[PDB]
Amino acid sequence: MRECISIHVGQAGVQIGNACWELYCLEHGIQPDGQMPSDDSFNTFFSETGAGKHVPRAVFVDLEPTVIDEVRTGTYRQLFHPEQLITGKEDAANNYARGHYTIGKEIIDLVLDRIRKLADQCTGLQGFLVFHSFGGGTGSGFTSLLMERLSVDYGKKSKLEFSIYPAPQVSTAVVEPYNSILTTHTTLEHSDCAFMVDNEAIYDICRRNLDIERPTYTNLNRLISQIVSSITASLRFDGALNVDLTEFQTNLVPYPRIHFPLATYAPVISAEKAYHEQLSVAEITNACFEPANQMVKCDPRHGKYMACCLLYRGDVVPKDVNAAIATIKTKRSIQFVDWCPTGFKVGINYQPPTVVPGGDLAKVQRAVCMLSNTTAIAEAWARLDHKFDLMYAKRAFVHWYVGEGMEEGEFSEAREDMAALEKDYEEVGV
Amino acid sequence: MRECISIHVGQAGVQIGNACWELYCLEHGIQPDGQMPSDDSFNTFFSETGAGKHVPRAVFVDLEPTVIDEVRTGTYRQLFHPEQLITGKEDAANNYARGHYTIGKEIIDLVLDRIRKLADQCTGLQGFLVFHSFGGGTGSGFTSLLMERLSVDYGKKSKLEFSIYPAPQVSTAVVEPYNSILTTHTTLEHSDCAFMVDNEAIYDICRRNLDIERPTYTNLNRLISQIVSSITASLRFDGALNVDLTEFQTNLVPYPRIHFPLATYAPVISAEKAYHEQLSVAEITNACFEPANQMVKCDPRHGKYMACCLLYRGDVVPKDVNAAIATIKTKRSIQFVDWCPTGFKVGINYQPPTVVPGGDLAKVQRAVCMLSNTTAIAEAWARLDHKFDLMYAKRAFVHWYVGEGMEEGEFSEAREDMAALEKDYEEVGV
Amino acid sequence: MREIVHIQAGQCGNQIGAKFWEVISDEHGIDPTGSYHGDSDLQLERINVYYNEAAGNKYVPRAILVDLEPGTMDSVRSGPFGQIFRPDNFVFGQSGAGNNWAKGHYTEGAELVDSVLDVVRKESESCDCLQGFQLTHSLGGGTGSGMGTLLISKIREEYPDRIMNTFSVMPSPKVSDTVVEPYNATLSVHQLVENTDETYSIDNEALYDICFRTLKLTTPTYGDLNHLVSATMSGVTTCLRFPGQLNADLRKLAVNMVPFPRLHFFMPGFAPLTSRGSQQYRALTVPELTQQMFDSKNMMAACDPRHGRYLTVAAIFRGRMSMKEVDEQMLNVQNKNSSYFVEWIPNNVKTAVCDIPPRGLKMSATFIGNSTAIQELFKRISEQFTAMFRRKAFLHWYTGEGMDEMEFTEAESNMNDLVSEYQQYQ
Amino acid sequence: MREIVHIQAGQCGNQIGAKFWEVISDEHGIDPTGSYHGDSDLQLERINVYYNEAAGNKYVPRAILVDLEPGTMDSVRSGPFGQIFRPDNFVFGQSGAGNNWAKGHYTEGAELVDSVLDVVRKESESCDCLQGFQLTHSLGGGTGSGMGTLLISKIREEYPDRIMNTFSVMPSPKVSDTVVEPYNATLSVHQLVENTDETYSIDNEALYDICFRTLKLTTPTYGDLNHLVSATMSGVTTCLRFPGQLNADLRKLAVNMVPFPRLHFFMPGFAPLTSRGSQQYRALTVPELTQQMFDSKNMMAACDPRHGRYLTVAAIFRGRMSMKEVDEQMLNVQNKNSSYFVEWIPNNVKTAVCDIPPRGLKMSATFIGNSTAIQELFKRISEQFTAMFRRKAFLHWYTGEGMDEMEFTEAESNMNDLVSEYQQYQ
Ligand SMILES: CC(=O)O[C@H]1C(=O)[C@@]2(C)[C@H]([C@H](OC(=O)c3ccccc3)[C@]3(O)C[C@H](OC(=O)[C@H](O)[C@@H](NC(=O)c4ccccc4)c4ccccc4)C(C)=C1C3(C)C)[C@]1(OC(C)=O)CO[C@@H]1C[C@@H]2O
Ligand SMILES: CC(=O)O[C@H]1C(=O)[C@@]2(C)[C@H]([C@H](OC(=O)c3ccccc3)[C@]3(O)C[C@H](OC(=O)[C@H](O)[C@@H](NC(=O)c4ccccc4)c4ccccc4)C(C)=C1C3(C)C)[C@]1(OC(C)=O)CO[C@@H]1C[C@@H]2O
Ligand SMILES: Nc1nc2c(ncn2[C@@H]2O[C@H](COP(=O)(O)OP(=O)(O)OP(=O)(O)O)[C@@H](O)[C@H]2O)c(=O)[nH]1
Ligand SMILES: Nc1nc2c(ncn2[C@@H]2O[C@H](COP(=O)(O)OP(=O)(O)OP(=O)(O)O)[C@@H](O)[C@H]2O)c(=O)[nH]1
Ligand SMILES: Nc1nc2c(ncn2[C@@H]2O[C@H](COP(=O)(O)OP(=O)(O)O)[C@@H](O)[C@H]2O)c(=O)[nH]1
Ligand SMILES: Nc1nc2c(ncn2[C@@H]2O[C@H](COP(=O)(O)OP(=O)(O)O)[C@@H](O)[C@H]2O)c(=O)[nH]1
Ligand SMILES: [Mg+2]
Ligand SMILES: [Mg+2]
């Protein structure tokens, strides 16, 4: 009942996983060895063996051994089933075609089988939670090989997808635009709700709200994990207005292809700041409509809102929430589309946000995660297809992709399909 | 009441015996000196003398001294009666005709005298358990000499036979195809249920399920003994649905010559994984229908099932078993014959599988041994009679067999009789 | 798990190699005896990248040593780490290359290469999963230039899909010890442009400039030059030997570094580099580590990158550091220096970050630049070559080995084709 | 319990024999005095296979020592282990064989064989169950070639069903010490093809090739050659002296190794063999033992197996090892080398595995090849014989012993019949 299989692909997905599973163990009170000292609240994420050991409903996949061998050696080595951690022989080299066509074939039929040996333990599997990098070779190419299989083997089941997406200026690779554009078929055809996130936006959120001058990835992953906990909290706990994983989508997604919401969390705040402000429902609701808190570097004021899911958790009351979203409807800078007169889906859940004890983020009685479908996100696509255009006009790295079994025409067919999505998000704003 | 005489022949049968008697001693709580510290559960396998010493109902036979002199010197030197460990001077040289006509001709009337002195201590002897190699000279030739005698001396009594059979690729001898084909008269005419087992299939089970990268024969024999403990468990213990040794045959054997079932065991599992798998009755039932767990390298999907005996042991309930076999009947890849609408014989026994303390195979609440009559096994015969045909077309080693008193025409008469068995298993699938 | 096979050719290749084996053995915590003596499980968890296990827990380097004289084998084997190598992996001739490429490629190394290749086969098939070949040599003289490129050709034909990664010390005008260096180098670069997946171009003039104007060494030896080379050799494989925030295999470098197939001639560098009398006064922090790393003085080929544009740079950082600070600095560099990067690539910098800095450093960066300025190294060699070849000088020593004058015309033709392809994007 | 009777003939047979008795006395832990001094019960359990028990728990080896000269008896009796043998079992003449087969077979040894054979009876009647005869000799010269094959004929007629198993050092052109070597061997091979159940063909050219190209010995003696032979003699009987996962008697070898009655001219080998200065760098394990064992440089006859196909190979392993790993490697060899095995046999490799490896190594493998490449050993002797015999050279030394010219014609006829039967299955 209410299970979610969680798939963590390549270094970014595995390292966000290593923060998600750090959080879910604390929030359910599971030890890092998988035991539980002293109710079904853990069941969405944890299978229970007869011995009294909890086991996570997850798969970690990397085509190179290094990051998953860290998990198999660090403090979580006792938690996972030693076959649900899957390592290939050779790296995908930031090349989509190694992930999808050449190295992915040597491990996909093992990955998909271990996913099936998790599904046979569920009773009403609610959906999939797929975590990856858009810029990676495994991140783009292996996720796109895996989603194509999952979308024929589990066609009804909703596939939610958490993507670290290329930034305006911050980048780690030269070929990040190629891998991202080649991924756009995956998200359009074989995904049901795709949460784009940006490293440069979280780096700025960390600088302004957390007072941390120079963050690592472990800081970012303790913000991305906090969103997925807050999405799943209605699946795991009691609330005044619990939201199902399918109910969420019926309010977020206005049209079949328009399933790329922004996400944001409030209050992101340092423990030193959190004493000197009161953090009421109205304050944390207004914080979600600041450009300063969006986790993709695009401005929501250059768009129109189609729908917002305000998923509150902790000590919040429907009085306060209605009184808050009445002020958001009053502000003329926050503009909805003419065809969504309701605008807001509200969720309210009684479980406060857990604090990771080694984290930068305050204890707070309340949080909200706002997940928001808006026309503005098309600018994050207009940035990256302008990076693609400069390189494909030269064929600047194309021999590495053609050399590993890809058709050269797939680059044109992917830039074409992205232009049809960037068209669709401009078309519905009117 | 409910005795079995276990006859262990050649090196393979004696070394499987040294694992069988290692297990039975642990399972009944008998010390390796035959004493029992502190119900008649042991009575099937052990005679009890007035000193409080339990002596096994076993005969060990080899035409050479080396392997039984090791049994006479190791930890079990005090278990066995010294004259039921039987040895000759001269090795059978992987030559059937030395085992049958020339060397075993001398030891046979001493082997029978021990079997007579064991049967005269039984009261309602249930049958014989005969352990051997198909590829050996003692394994093929001496077992076929002995069975011809036991089938006139004890004509009513059920003769169950456990055979290590030649593999698709793994082989230890050049003449393994000759000895195996010459044995096919023994199993057809002088046996009642013959369990073929393959070294290469267990080597692959060890690699995939125990995760031992490089196993010895001690690892194989500890799986082969575990199946016979599970066949005999209903003779030895209390259960919900105990199965008699002839009740077993009345459900396994559809036709007089169609008595070559496959065997498999589940869960084969290591201590690394047994604490993370559920090992529910549904999973360990389904594991028996995987090609991955069959102990002969043939694919059951290239056959049809005639009958299955699912012999469960440990903590199981008839609710769970009926609910499990209902899913097996639902799966279109597991195909029964049109003339067996019932298909399944179920046994359920309350005694869990005993761990050998030195072993790789983990402690578990449940096991099933599935013993299964299927048309697929004819491919393991089609492999080996194609090895025979290449050598007999040249008469490639025939002078060693003709030189030791065999008729040359017995090779044609054995390849002929094998083709009539391989015909019978193809004929009944329709 | 991503094994490497490492090969040393001639005096220079065996000297930069036998110094590298002292560096990566100090990283992995291996005694000169071959015994493990390190601190950390992270030192041992990837020792299979460069070593084989042997009985008694002795570790043997997966190195093959090649020469046409015994005297460099005697110099490596009698050296500080000389005991650590497998005695049966020393493969040698008994008369030198004479500083002649054609002796290396056609006569004295053509005899020997079959006894190299069967040792390379023994070590490569004994690997679990080979990633590539790491070959150290020089382009001057005859053993490294002519036998090493024969050996690249033979290994390339047998392992077509594995990374061929070469570290190539090569001629420059103001620091030279051979008359026939331009001939040997021109005949050798003709093999590297076709066969290698990466070649790291290294210069004794630039390695002396680091020693004089950065380290302030009064009398830098070849042992001090070999220490600068081997730091960048340890640097680029770090991400398959140790964990990190961003992992980059040698192939993950190649896909990002090499836009068009033949433009794989890189220029390495290292940070920090200080005098031992100024390490007390400097911060090793990522901004200071970056301002050094992009300095025209820090790079190990004499080509000033300000005489061209980078196609790609890779900065492989090591140590506990912020990804914001690393991503900030690799942005600030290519925006404030935008006239020195090609403007048809939207980001020219690859980054990688390992969690384990070199022993005795809190941070390190290894730099790889694919600058068009490297046209100057191939140009000046081609201009030295042209002057000797226009009058056929010294060619009886090469044509005596049965080489054609047509092969000199064709090698310098292919050299100018390499110069033209770098100049095209400038 | 499967006793063996061992017989030594001429200088070579007594020298490979007197070294063999030092090797198996080290295995069984027997002192040069004949007293037992070993570690283990397994050493004593089968000591009857090669020794007789005598008073005071002294062990006396079941050798018969045969020569036509006293000087090799004097050299054995005075040697490292000479005092071990029974004084009555030294059976000898005074005037030698003159390197003449016909002196061995018709004159000097025909006188002596009545005094040999009646000692072979005293040892065979002291046996509980004799399995066979293990005869060491050479096919060059006159004592081993001509008296040893007289003695094979006499023991074969008296014991027709016991294993006759011979270790036969035999001529080759590049390592030769006798003018009439081709004659003596051709007259002797004519007896071996009819009477023996197994003959292990050994060559001084191949035993010197192991000493130079594997062991790297600078000056290999006959004592070093005798050590390589006697390692494979200890090897093939191991499975009746020690326990194992797969036991193979000399008869269990013969049934698997000899497809057609006369094709029993085997070719032995041994592993691991390592250069003395290199052992610490080598991993002792089943796939390295395999890659040595199945390579053309390791076999103890001059025949390169790449000039034929194997009929059967037996690999008798010793040590604690996996049956999956043994069965995997003996599969991988004959599938990856399938052009070198006959394709009318569906598996060409016999395996055996003993639990007790030789003293001082963790594992070992004795290799026995049967291959159509053994045609080359019989061919080159037959063509050296032919080139002398067309001009009747040296025949007055043989016809002086009353031998016919017809016996030379009939021996070389039977030699070409043995060459033709191996070449038939090529
Ligand atoms: C107290 C202190 O700070 O000591 C430093 C030091 O003073 C300086 C000057 C060191 C020092 O470097 C040199 O003296 C040197 C001389 C000629 C050529 C190259 C280097 C040092 O010797 C070098 C040494 O580096 C290492 O030990 C690294 O692990 C290095 N390996 C070796 O140098 C090595 C030496 C002997 C045997 C085996 C290895 C390494 C480099 C890259 C990748 C892996 C390992 C270090 C930190 C120092 C001293 C000791 C003074 C410097 O080198 C490095 C690589 O850090 C030179 O400029 C840097 C900055 C350092 O501050
Ligand atoms: C520390 C160490 O590794 O010692 C080894 C050794 O260095 C090497 C080089 C040994 C050594 O072998 C030789 O030197 C040699 C020289 C000429 C001809 C044959 C051998 C060794 O002497 C030989 C000796 O082997 C034995 O003792 C065997 O049990 C052997 N018996 C004898 O050699 C022997 C010697 C004196 C008296 C009686 C017996 C044997 C072989 C087959 C069957 C039964 C017994 C061993 C392990 C070693 C040394 C001591 C260096 C090697 O031999 C063996 C049989 O292992 C040669 O290649 C192997 C690999 C070994 O590593
Ligand atoms: N927030 C965050 N971003 C990460 C993390 N790890 C990697 N990234 C991002 O991942 C993007 C590039 O993808 P890769 O890390 O190379 O993805 P990959 O699947 O491992 O790629 P391959 O090595 O080719 O298989 C970069 O833009 C990084 O900023 C992490 O732990 N947290
Ligand atoms: N699983 C297993 N297989 C064994 C064992 N011992 C031998 N075998 C198999 O036995 C088969 C060959 O038969 P032999 O071992 O030679 O049988 P044998 O009766 O002793 O033959 P003879 O020596 O001629 O008397 C091979 O295919 C081996 O894989 C053992 O302990 N376990
Ligand atoms: N860095 C470095 N350069 C060297 C070394 N030895 C020689 N060189 C230089 O680089 C060139 C190498 O050529 P060399 O290796 O002698 O030719 P080879 O032996 O025929 O391959 C020489 O002319 C020297 O200038 C050394 O130990 N280190
Ligand atoms: N391996 C080995 N070969 C020997 C030895 N002594 C001689 N040989 C060689 O093999 C041949 C043996 O012939 P030999 O035994 O002298 O003839 P015989 O005494 O008449 O039987 C000689 O020509 C030598 O080349 C020895 O100790 N060991
Ligand atoms: Mg990756
Ligand atoms: Mg046997």
Residue B279's SS3 state is coil
* Closest listed residue to residue A102, CA positions, set A115, A91, A113: A91
Residue C192 to residue B151: CA distance in whole angstroms: 79
Q: Enumerate neighbours of A (3 or more CB pairs within 8 A).
A: B, C
Instruction: Write down the residue that tokens 């649905």 correspond to.
Output: B241
Ligand 1: centre distance to CA C279 (Å) = 11
Alpha-carbon gap, residue D346 to D354, rounded angstroms: 25
Chain B: residue nearest A46 by CA?
A: B276
Residue nearest to atom 13 of ligand 6 (CA): D141
What's the rounded Cα separation, in Å, for the pair C158 and B307? 54
Q: How far is the CA of D170 from the centre of ligand 6 (A)?
A: 9
Q: Tokens 């470098």 correspond to what residue?
A: C253
Do C9 and C44 fall into the same domain?
yes
Q: How many domains would you assign to chain D?
A: 3
A51 touches chain B (CB under 8 A): yes
Q: Which residues contact C183 (CB under 8 A, 6 or more apart)?
A: C101, C385, C388, C389, C394, C398, C408
Asked how this structure was determined, the answer is: cryo-EM
Shared-domain flag, residues C65 and C125: yes
Structure tokens at D1: 């319990």
Q: Hey, what are A430's tokens?
A: 């009117």
Contact by Cβ (8 Å): B313, B233: yes
Q: Which two tokens stand for residue D388?
A: 């002398």
Q: Are strands D349-354 and D244-246 parallel, antiparallel or unpaired?
A: antiparallel
Residue type at C269? G
Q: How many CB atoms lie within 10 A of CB B280?
A: 17
Are D301 and D206 a contacting pair, CB within 8 Å?
Answer: yes
CATH number at residue C244: 3.40.50.1440
d(CA D422, CA D418): 7
Q: How far apart are the C-alpha atoms of D216 and D218, rounded to whole Å?
A: 6
Candidates B270, B122, B295, B142; CA nearest to B204 is: B295
Annotated ligand binding at D11? The verdict is yes
CB of A114 within 8 Å of any CB in chain B? no
CB proximity D276 to C under 8 Å: no
Task: Say if residue B65 is preceded by a cis peptide, omega within 30 of 0.
Answer: no
> Are A and C neighbours with ≥3 CB pairs closer than 8 A?
yes
- CA distance linking residue C47 with residue C51, whole number of Å: 6
Q: How many CA atoms lie within 13 A of C312 on its CB side?
A: 26
In angstroms, rounded to a whole number, what is the distance separating the alpha carbons of residues A169 and A154? 38
Q: Which of D214, D227, D230 to mutate to test the pocket of ligand 2 (most atoms within 8 A of CB)?
A: D227
End-to-end CA distance of chain D: 39
Beta strands in A235-314 (DSSP E): 239-241, 262-266, 305-314
Asked if A216 and C322 touch (Cβ cutoff 8 Å), the reply is yes
Residues 6+ positions from A69 with CB-CB distance below 8 Å: A87, C45
Same domain, D185 and D40: yes
Closest Cα to residue D382, out of D176, D171, D106, D202? D171
Sign of torsion over alpha carbons D283, D284, D287, D291: positive
Antiparallel, parallel or unpaired: β B158-165 and B193-198: parallel
Cα–Cα distance measured from residue D367 to residue B68, given in angstroms and rounded to the nearest whole number? 27
Taking the centre of ligand 7 as the mean of its atom positions, its distance from the CA of residue A397, in whole angstroms, is: 18
Question: Which sign, positive or negative, has the C-alpha torsion A365, A197, A247, A287?
Answer: positive
Put simply, the answer to whether B394 touches D243 (Cβ < 8 Å) is no
C278, C255, C277, C196: which is closest to C7 by C-alpha?
A: C196
Residue nearest (by alpha carbon) to ligand 3 atom 5: A12
Query: A424, A411 in Cβ contact below 8 A?
Result: no
Q: Are C163 and C250 in contact (CB under 8 A)?
A: yes
Mutate to test the pocket of ligand 2, among D237, D279, D282, D317 (most ligand atoms within 8 A of CB): D279
Pairing of strands B262-266, B366-374: antiparallel
Cβ within 8 Å of C, A 54-83: 64-67, 69-70, 73
Q: Tell me the residue type at D395.
A: L
Domains of chain B plus CATH, in order, are: 1-261 (3.40.50.1440), 262-376 (3.30.1330.20), 377-430 (1.10.287.600)
Q: CB of A336 within 8 A of CB of A343?
A: yes
Instruction: Clarify whether residues C271 and C287 are in a common domain.
Output: yes
Q: In C260-312, which ranges are continuous DSSP H helix?
A: 286-293
Answer whether A touches D (≥3 Cβ pairs < 8 Å): no
The DSSP output letter for C35 is B
3-state secondary structure of D235: helix
Closest CA to A70 of A92, A85, A53: A85
Complete edge-to-edge strand list for the sheet that includes strand A239-241:
A239-241, A344-349, A305-314, A366-374, A262-266
Whether D135 and D12 map to the same domain: the answer is: yes
Residue C46 CA, distance from chain mean position: 21
- CATH code where residue D268 lies: 3.30.1330.20
| D249-288 burial: b if 16+ Cβ within 10 Å, else e | bbbbbbbbbbbbeebbbbbbbbbbbbeeeeebbbebbbeb
Tell whether D63 and D168 lie within a shared domain.
yes
Q: Ligand 6: which residue has its CA nearest to atom 8?
A: D12
The 3-state DSSP class for residue C16 equals: helix
Residue C361 CA to ligand 5 centre (angstroms) = 29
What is the spatial order of strands in the sheet that B366-374 belongs to?
Answer: B239-241, B344-349, B305-314, B366-374, B262-266
| Any A CB within 8 A of B365 CB | yes
Distance separating alpha carbons of residues D313 and B275, to the nearest angstrom = 46
Q: Counting Cβ atoms within 10 Å, is residue D390 exposed (0-12), middle (13-18) or buried (19+)?
A: exposed
The DSSP call for residue A106 is: G
**H or E, element range at C133:** strand C130-138
B134 touches B171 (CB < 8 A): no
Among B48, B90, B247, B410, the one annotated catalytic: B247
DSSP-assigned states of every residue in B234-270 = HHHS-EEE---HHHHHHHH-SSTT----EEEEE----
Residue of C243, C251, C323 with shortest CB distance to A91: C251
Which residue among A70, A200, A247, A283 is the active-site one? A247
Q: Could you tell me if D356 and D392 lie in one domain?
A: no
Asked whether C276 lines ligand 1 (CB < 6 A), one says: yes
Single-letter code of the amino acid located at D366: T
Q: How far is B272 from chain A (nearest CA, A)?
A: 7
Helix (H, G, I), strand (E, B) or coil at D320: coil
Cβ neighbours around B35 below 10 Å, total:
13
**Roughly what angle, to the nearest 10 degrees, separates helices B143-153 and B104-119?**
40
CB C355 within 8 A of CB C244: yes
CA distance A284 to A210: 15
Amino acid letter, A339: W
Strand intervals (E) in D194-236: 198-203
Q: Which amino acid is it at A333?
A: S
The answer to whether residues D214 and D345 belong to one domain is no
Cβ separation of D281 and C86 shorter than 8 Å?
A: yes
User: What b/e string do you get for A333-371 counting C-beta neighbours within 10 Å, with b at 16 or more?
Assistant: ebebbeebeebbbbbbbebbbbbbeebbbbebebbbbbb
- Clarify whether A148 is annotated catalytic: no
Q: What are phi and psi of A289, to 5 degrees?
A: -100, 10
Counting CB pairs under 8 A, whether chains A and B reach 3 or more, is: yes
Question: Which ligand has the shortest distance to the CA of D284?
Answer: 2
Question: Is C23 in the same domain as C155?
Answer: yes
Measured between alpha carbons, how far is D119 from D125 in angstroms, rounded to an integer?
10
- Among the three residues C219, C239, C259, which one is the final residue of a domain in this structure? C259
CA dist., res. C196 & res. C198, Å (int): 5
Distance (Å, rounded) from C-alpha B48 to C-alpha B253?
34
- Nearest 10 degrees: CA dihedral of A59, A64, A66, A70? 10
Q: Tell me the H-state helices in C294-352.
A: 323-336
Phi/psi region, residue B267 (left: phi>0; alpha: psi -120 to 50; beta: rest), is beta
Binding residues of C for GDP: 11-12, 15, 138, 142-144, 177, 204, 222, 226
What is the atom index within ligand 4 of the atom nearest the CA of B202? Answer: 1
- The answer on C85 and C219 residing in a single domain is yes
Other CB atoms within 10 A of residue A244 CB: 15
Contact A150, A142 (CB under 8 A): no
Name the 3-class secondary structure at D153. helix
Which chain A residues in 179-238 lie under 8 Å from chain B, judged by CB atoms?
none
* DSSP state letters, D335-383: HHTGGGB-TTSS--EEEEEES-PPTT-SEEEEEEEEEGGGHHHHHHHHH
The structure tokens listed for B179 are: 């000895």
- For A415, other C-beta atoms within 10 Å of its C-beta total 16
Q: In what order do the strands lie in the sheet with D130-138?
A: D90-92, D63-67, D3-9, D130-138, D163-170, D198-203, D265-271, D363-371, D310-319, D349-354, D244-246
The Cα A331–Cα A309 span in angstroms is 18
- Residue A370 contacts residue A311 (beta carbons within 8 Å): yes
Are B376 and B340 contacting, i.e. CB atoms less than 8 angstroms apart?
A: no
Residue A274, φ and ψ in degrees, nearest 5: -65, -15
Same domain, C15 and C123: yes
Q: Is the dihedral of CA B411, B416, B422, B424 positive or negative?
A: negative
Kindly give, in sequence order, each residue whose CB lies less than 8 Å from that of residue A40, ignoring residues fewer than 6 positions away.
A1
Q: Residues A32, A75: contact at Cβ < 8 Å? A: yes
What single DSSP character describes residue C36? B
Distances, alpha carbon D108 to alpha carbons B11, B160, D103, D188, in Å: 48, 64, 5, 16
User: Is D353 exposed, middle or buried, given 0-12, 13-18 or 19+ CB atoms closer than 10 A?
Assistant: buried
Cα separation, D220 vs D236, in Å, equals 25
Distance separating alpha carbons of residues C323 and C321, to the nearest angstrom? 7
CATH of the domain at D384: 1.10.287.600
Is A206 part of the contact surface with chain C (CB cutoff 8 Å)?
A: yes
Residues C75 and C120 in one domain: yes
CA dihedral in degrees (B310, B313, B314, B315; nearest 10)? 30
| Domain span including residue C156 | 1-259
Q: What is the rounded CA–CA span in Å between residue B149 and residue B142? A: 11
The maximal CA–CA distance of chain B, rounded, in angstroms, is 63
Q: How far apart are CA B375 and CA A48, in angstroms?
A: 40
Give phi and psi for C301, each to the nearest 5: -130, 140
Rounded to an integer, what distance in angstroms lies between the CA atom of residue B155 and that of residue B369?
A: 28
